[PDB]
Amino acid sequence: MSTKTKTIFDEIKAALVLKVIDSPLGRKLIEEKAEKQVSKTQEAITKPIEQLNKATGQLLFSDTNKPLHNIELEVWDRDVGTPSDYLGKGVTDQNGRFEIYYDPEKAGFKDAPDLELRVIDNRVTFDSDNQPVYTNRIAYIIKGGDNVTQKTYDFGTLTVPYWPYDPNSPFARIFMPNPEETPDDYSVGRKFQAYASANVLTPIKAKHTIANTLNPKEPSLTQIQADYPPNLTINLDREKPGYTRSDEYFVLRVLNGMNPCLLKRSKSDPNQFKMSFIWDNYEKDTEHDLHNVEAYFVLKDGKLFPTMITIQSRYPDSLAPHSPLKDREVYTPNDGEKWLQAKRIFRTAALFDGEAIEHYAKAHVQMEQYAVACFRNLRKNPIRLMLTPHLKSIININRRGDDLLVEPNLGLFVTNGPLTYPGFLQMCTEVVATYDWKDWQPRQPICDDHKYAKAANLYWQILTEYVDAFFAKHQQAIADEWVEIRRFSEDLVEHSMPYQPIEGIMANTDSDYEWYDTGELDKPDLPRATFNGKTKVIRPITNSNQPSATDIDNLKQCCRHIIFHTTLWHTWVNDSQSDEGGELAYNSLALRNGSFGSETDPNIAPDPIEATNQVYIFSVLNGIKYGLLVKNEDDDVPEELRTALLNRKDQFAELGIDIGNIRTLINI
Ligand SMILES: [Fe+2]
Ligand code: NA
């Protein structure tokens, strides 16, 4: 086997690299990498303006050719084999035009400056006394004329690749071939936690992988499970045997698990509920099985009990979408082990769906567009201070997932998922083509045990208070620089997906059943705009250069949406990955060879390498936990939000939630 040797050397290689980085050598390089990307903020050139010289011009985005507005510019002298010299500061106007006053005399050495224009980025931090701290970063450098001896030097109109859009993605994403040159890097802490976690967990996965080549049936599932730390379900079953396989727990995790199911209620019998996963739209891979599974529940006295689970499976042959299905089967809670096996199958469909749609699609992809637009257009406007800390760093993790999670042949969700890469992708494009911010609100609690709904609504009201307060406080500044909000809106609409009414797994085909709550769902009746000849999925926040009641409310809602999904939602879906899928016997992204058998059957379960990679990835992804609202390890979370969340600590406690476990952003 040609693959065995290279696989081994690759696992070894990975291990060694992690040794190097998770060490003094690695840490020094990381920390210094962080320190160099800080631009020393220069002081104003106080001197008579007549005695000063000037440089003028206009800056445009390289991809939209729109003005690069309100961005800081520094005039420097670039000298060969000599340190550069600072000559003057200034900003672009809303048309990207600039008239920088610079002093040639800070040349010192030469008779005339050889000009160099720097585009300057910056992050805002709050100090001890809650006052803004501006930390610069060099965004771009343009070479200007040499021997400049004119009292006005003009660059004219130039383009700048500032946060460019990826033209090869079906999604609005940043263009980042080299993730090593991100314009928004992680914190050194986030990096350190990552490399540490990986250094602990990777030698295990490596051991298993190397072991698998020596014997394709080894290591056992028992050995793989043992060699990793236990998860929630293992612990639970260690206290009370078989608890997590019970109906009560099945329902609880359907409601509040990693994939918190938005159930369908019956129109005739409002006590009847169901959840459908149908994959007729998608291409099955050759290894795993595919199951159209539907779980039915009844509501009795504020409790949800499972009534049946129907399973309709693809033949192993049935690869292409809409290929033949085996006869649908029906399972009730008294059908014993076939009932238990049905519950496991449902769990796996729910886990793969949860990772594709609820996680990767709804959280990562949907929020990246807001990130890119935000950092593209929000500078002078206070809303920046409100949005950036939640949208920062997400470009990094998505670009990483391009290799780690959703790579055409090596990514976990593709490989371990029952679909081909085109299938998984199709799920993603399908749902993201319908995600908008307008009139969006969290689902309502079906019952008292519906923890996620209660949690989500509480958090939502917190966000409402926060947003209202913030908008009130910075009203004048928000209005004064509303143009930024317009450019923000325009970038969002223009770069979003073309709208496409829902289809596939998340589309209801049932006449009897309707979504019990529609607040999170797509509102097709609400008008959407058109760009480039297609109706766009994201609705515009504004189309005027000054705010109005409508426009302001629009912005407030968009802000609520963004903050909600970048904090609580992603927290919930991501940090629940171990709890749902840490134990192989209980859950996986797919099943094999009929999917029916005892949960100890290694033929049904993932093969050793898929298994170990499953547990590895879940444990890593939930094991890295940097960036929490309460902890505020980056000192950039506006204090109003913090105090709003802290104020409501105990109501969250009453739902078994620590507000300190709520992440600030998406960076894992
Ligand atoms: Fe994530
Ligand atoms: Na696959």
Maximum separation of any 2 CA atoms in the chain, in Å: 93
Annotated binding-site residue? 570? yes
Alpha helices in 53-119, H assignment, sequence order? none
Nearest-angstrom CA–CA distance, 246 and 295? 15
Query: What's the CA-to-centroid distance between 134 and ligand 1, angstroms?
Result: 29
CA distances from 601 to 30, 390, 481, 598, 616 (A): 45, 43, 63, 6, 21
Cβ neighbours of 99 (radius 10 Å): 13
Annotated binding-site residue? 364? yes
Residue from 626, 653, 633, 636 nearest 195 by CA? 626
With H, G, I as helix, E, B as strand and everything else as coil, classify residue 97.
strand
Q: Resolution of the deposited coordinates, in angstroms?
A: 2.7
Nearest-angstrom CA–CA distance, 106 and 116? 14
Q: Which ligand is nearest to the CA of 422?
A: 2
Q: Which ligand is nearest to the CA of 668?
A: 1
Task: Note down the domain range covering 61.
Answer: 49-174
Structure tokens, 123 = 């992050």
Q: Could you tell me which residues are beta bridge partners of residue 50? A: none
Nearest-angstrom CA–CA distance, 172 and 180? 20
The technique by which this structure was obtained is: X-ray
Query: What's the CA-to-centroid distance between 421 and ligand 2, angstroms?
Result: 7
Q: Which residues of 327-349 are buried (b: 16+ CB within 10 A; e: fewer)?
A: eeeebebeeeeebbbbbbbbbbb
Query: What's the CA-to-centroid distance between 113 and ligand 1, angstroms?
Result: 49
Query: What's the CA-to-centroid distance between 413 and ligand 2, angstroms?
Result: 8
Q: Which ligand is nearest to the CA of 359?
A: 1
Query: What's the CA-to-centroid distance between 423 and ligand 2, angstroms?
Result: 9
Structure tokens, 580 = 């749902």
Query: What's the CA-to-centroid distance between 657 and ligand 1, angstroms?
Result: 19
User: DSSP secondary-structure letter at 69?
Assistant: -
Query: What's the CA-to-centroid distance between 589 and ligand 2, angstroms?
Result: 9
Nearest-angstrom CA–CA distance, 472 and 545? 19
Annotated binding-site residue? 495? no
Query: What's the CA-to-centroid distance between 595 and ligand 2, angstroms?
Result: 15
Query: What's the CA-to-centroid distance between 149 and ligand 2, angstroms?
Result: 65
Cβ(649)–Cβ(376) below 8 Å: no
Which domain CATH number covers 138? 2.60.40.3330
Structure tokens, 391 = 């949208």
Q: Residue 12 is inside which H or E element, if any?
A: helix 2-21
Write the DSSP assignment of 580-637 as a string of letters. Answer: HHS-TTT--S--BTTS-S-TT-TTTSPPHHHHHHHHHHHHHHHH----BTTT-TTS-S
Query: What's the CA-to-centroid distance between 61 and ligand 2, angstroms?
Result: 39
Annotated binding-site residue? 288? no
Query: What's the CA-to-centroid distance between 59 and ligand 2, angstroms?
Result: 46
Query: What's the CA-to-centroid distance between 524 and ligand 2, angstroms?
Result: 33
Q: Which ligand is nearest to the CA of 592?
A: 2
Q: Which ligand is nearest to the CA of 590?
A: 2
Q: Which ligand is nearest to the CA of 606?
A: 2
